[model samples]
Target: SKPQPIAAANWKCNGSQQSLSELIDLFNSTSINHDVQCVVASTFVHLAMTKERLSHPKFVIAAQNAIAKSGAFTGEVSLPILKDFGVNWIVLGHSERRAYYGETNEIVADKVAAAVASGFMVIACIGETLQERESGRTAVVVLTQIAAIAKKLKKADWAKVVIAYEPVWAIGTGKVATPQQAQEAHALIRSWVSSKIGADVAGELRILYGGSVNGKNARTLYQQRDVNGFLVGGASLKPEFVDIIKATQ
Candidate 1:
């Protein structure tokens, strides 16, 4: 089976209204591969404007983060609020949120549960830091994260969650994992999924690689059988993003 390919751009507190206008113009004008699913995750403040701007069904808008409940979490944006804006996808547990704000694995699982209940698909991110990788605890660390989600998600939720594997060391350091390294991590993740659920579901799941995925390297990464697509960062903001979208083809 061909795993579904998704190329999601995480704007991550970036771009102004003008920048977004330019990007939206480029995205609407570009001839992207229909086989690859396209996603743009914007800062919370931009979701409504982005949703309004993207009339194309080919482009999906995602919330960078969402709260676990509809109640008084104070400064947090709840799932219902996102749905009100017509947002259908949310990025959860990105490494930055985990490190900077102290989002635990348990907390991410709670959000996944709430997001699914709110009828939103999720892009769930998990990764190991430089220290964890060097210590050879990468598998242990990643498995722990997966285990947390597995406990919270129902059997039906598997269809809606996409796993993005990002190596913390490579994220913004201009470093990318070699194809071999990415394949190794991705394969491990798939196997873990198979063990937890079933081989059938694991085969169907799309595990994307994120870490300095520029157009120059996107094709090679996409060619790896286990690497279904990308959770793109810097490169996704540029015109070359069109090339990355066609990389597999």
Candidate 2:
């Protein structure tokens, strides 16, 4: 069976109550493809409001980040706490998190393991930097990242994971990977899953392309066999997101 496509919006460090309400209104008024899963990841402060305001059945709320465990980690939110508020999907290991917050591959794997154990679905992100890509190390770097998370997951847990491949160089830089480039990376990742985890898991796994994805390029990118969907960044906040979602159809 083909993996169901997902079009997720990462509103990363953006959105206000007024803006969120407006975006929610837009989403509420629009119709979504039944086959596609739509998600909106709001900043922690606005998650409850996003949940309350966004009423579309096809739309699910996601958290941008969560700590691996529940504790007195001041200024941090945990999986249990996020669950308490109805946020089920977590975006872990984003390039921003790894680059800015020092979240290493092992750290990301730990978080993924913890989230899965706590019954939360995870969008585990993995990608390579520009330097790595320029040096022809894309596969080596991405696979290393994937291996860390793959080691921690059980076969059953694979059902709850969606891998988003957002090349660090492209993120927020307005540099979208050409469809061929995106497909090549996605295919490589899928092949790795097949060899390491099993063919069935690899076939069913959803791998999303992030970084500079927008309405215009989504159609071409989504056409790739292994490119399941997108983990959209900047454009996700705009009405153009609707076009991207529709592209899956």
Candidate 3:
């Protein structure tokens, strides 16, 4: 079976109350194919305010990050609070988080374990940097990153996790993986899943691409056999995002 398609928007440090309303209106009016799942990972501040507005039968509202505990963490929103707000999807281990912040593999692993335990669906990101890709260690680096998560979660937990493959080099660099390059990397990730749990589980896994995806390239990327969908960044804030969503149809 083909993995279900997902088109997720990551609104990082962008948008306002007014902007969000307009985006929601656009989505409400846009025609969405039932074949795909949609998600918006808005900033933490916006989630509490816009959760009601963004909620729709066809898509989900997501958090850019989450903390393990219910409370007591200064300047961090707990998973329980997000759960209370009915936020079902959470993005973890994004390359930007791993690089700018000090989210080591262990930290990401712990975050995944906690999110799964809390019963929230997660988009767990993993990728290689430009230097790592240049050194021809893409597979090694990616596998290691995922292995940490595997070690933390039981095979059963994978049901709640979606993997986002965002090459750090391609993100914001205006460069993209050729269709063949994207396929190769996605195939390798699927192979790891097959080996880790079983071929059935691997086949059912949704592996999304998250590096500089735009309306122009989205169709080609989605055409790849293993490319399940996209975790869109800059494009997510623009009206063109609707075109990207339509591509999967």
Candidate 4:
């Protein structure tokens, strides 16, 4: 069986209470296809409110980031604390986190391992930078990132994970990968999983394309055989998010 399509909104560091409420209202008022899993990730401050207001069965909340362990990490959110607020899904290893915060591959793997151990679903992000891509090292860079996380995960842990391929150059830059590029990358990732993990696990893994995925281009990208869905950024903050969700159908 094919993995179910997932359309996840990575609101990033955006959204205020009022704006979030309005977006939630928009989502709630619209009818989404049940076959598509709609996820909205908000900043830590808006998570609880977003979770409370977004009541559609097909919709779920995600945290943009989290720490592997709980304690005096100061500003960091942990898995236990996130679960307390009814947020089950966590996005880890986002390129923004890696680039801006210096989250090394090892650190990301540790966080992913910890989150999985504690029973949290994760959107594990991996991609190459423009420099890396231009140098023809996209495969090496992406695979290394995946290998770091794969080392920490058991076969069972994969059930709760989704891989988001957001090339650093394309993220929020209005430079979406061509549909063929997206398909080729997704196919590479899936093939890696099949060879490194088991074929059955690879078959079930959901690989999402994340970048400048606006509603206008979503359907074309989703048509790729290996492109399971999207991890939308700016577009997810707008009403067009509905169109992206519709593309999954």
Candidate 5:
């Protein structure tokens, strides 16, 4: 396969306005070894703020979520709204949303279709719960989610898509997926994309591993054949986040 590449971090509901600025500075100050696309998934209230503060030719920022579309919903921020705010990327189908907010594959695909329409890149989340994994449904669950979204858009839409395979059990449990385990899942996901969307799309799509990805484990994850990046959780909070960003160095 082509050389494994790229990395990203999702600062999920973390940091105050003051600290967000500090993070942007830290990312810029750090010297990273890998030629990776570094991003921070800024909070909803701060998406526009992040875009403004972190705007650069290199470092990038993303959104935690985008409402399926523009609407009258009270607490929803749509893709157009996010675009208006200057966000370049958005994360969809996170386990937190799936379990807490009742997000389903169909709902996620709708959001992907909407985000693609609005021209925002996506970090599409896919994974199964501990029960689902224990039941040996990991591949079925992950592939199903990927297919559901991939089928929603034309081949062109995929160029803006990045898959984050975040197993529910490993998330925040300190039970990080071994590097090999992560490779297995990501490789399978890439294969699924190739089988359905053709080889070119599969080769280009970036598959990320999420859940408790921190400084201690970032290097191991980065070394995997298919582990292109991360959709970090708590670790995205501290300056160590910079170490993870600079793990290759």
Candidate 6:
């Protein structure tokens, strides 16, 4: 696969089973022409229910997040539980978790290793704060997280990972990265992978842009060289999501 353009919609603690059915039903009828990988990160409680409603093969359900390994980690969703729920993807790291839940780079590494080890595709999040970006250490902040955790994965596992570049300032702040900026960051992440891992693996990785991605900007953003796709949030709730889905076509 050329990785085409990919997307994952994180519904994030929203929607009950009844709503999930209607949502997937409407989405199933919507015309999707773009060669994007559209996924829904909904409540795990509804994964199997969603799978039953989804037959297009274009859509999948994934865990919004998960705890490291399988054990007595109360209040944590285990990798086994996610896989058992029929999820094919897992969002490993997010800035909020790092800040609120005390998720360090080491914690994310452990999660990534466990998720991949447990046979789930991982959209591992990596980024830096605005100060880091302003201080000319944006690359450092990103590469540090990427390089350290990336070392723990097997070379052949690159395809299962989606590198989401979400700069701190851009996240939920109405400040989107310019298309060029996003392209640059995406390219930088791939470069880091190639330099730290190997050229072969780097070429295969899909660098996805996150933070306030919407149907309005999908076309231009998707035009960037290394901007493979998006990790949409709010716009994903509407049929406009299907419009973004059909962007490439």
Predictions in order: lDDT:
0.86, 0.90, 0.88, 0.89, 0.79, 0.79
lDDT winner, 1 or 4: 4
**lDDT: worst 10-residue window of model 3:** 48-57
* lDDT string, candidate 6, 25-117, tens digits: 888887675566788887777777777887776777788898866788887888887777667688878777886888989999989988888
Residue-level lDDT tens digits of model 2 in 1-249: 458999999999998888889989999999874699998999999988988888999999999999977887999999888988878899999988999999999999999999999888899999998889888999999999999998998999999999999878665566556789888999999999999889999999999988677788888988999988899988988999999999987
Q: Which of 2 and 4 is ahead in lDDT?
A: 2
- Candidate 1 stretches with Cα past 4 Å from truth are 172-176
Which has the greatest lDDT? 2
Q: Give the alpha carbon lDDT tens digit for every residue of 1-249 in model 4.
A: 558999999998898888889989999999874599898889998877887888888998889998866898997888888887778888999988898998999999999998899888889999998878888998898999999999998999999999999878765566657899989888899999999999999999999998778889999998889999999988998999999999998
Q: What TM-score goes with each of the models?
A: 0.95, 0.97, 0.96, 0.96, 0.92, 0.92
Write down the TM-score for model 3: 0.96
In model 4, pairs of residues that clash are none
lDDT of 1 by residue, 77-192 (tens): 98898898788998999988999998999999999888987888898999998878888999999999998988988878899999999888666666657989999999999999
| Clash totals for all candidate models | 0, 0, 0, 0, 0, 0
Give the Å shift of residue 138 in candidate 3. 0.4
lDDT of 5 at 217: 83
Alpha-carbon shift of residue 114 in model 6 (angstroms): 0.9
Q: What is the C-alpha RMSD of each candidate to the true structure, in Å?
A: 1.4, 1.3, 1.3, 1.4, 2.0, 1.9
Could you tell me the lDDT of residue 209 within candidate 6? 82
What does the lDDT read for residue 22 in candidate 5? 81
| Winner of 4 and 5 under TM-score | 4
Model 2 TM-score on a 0 to 1 scale:
0.97
Assess candidate 2 and give its lDDT. 0.90
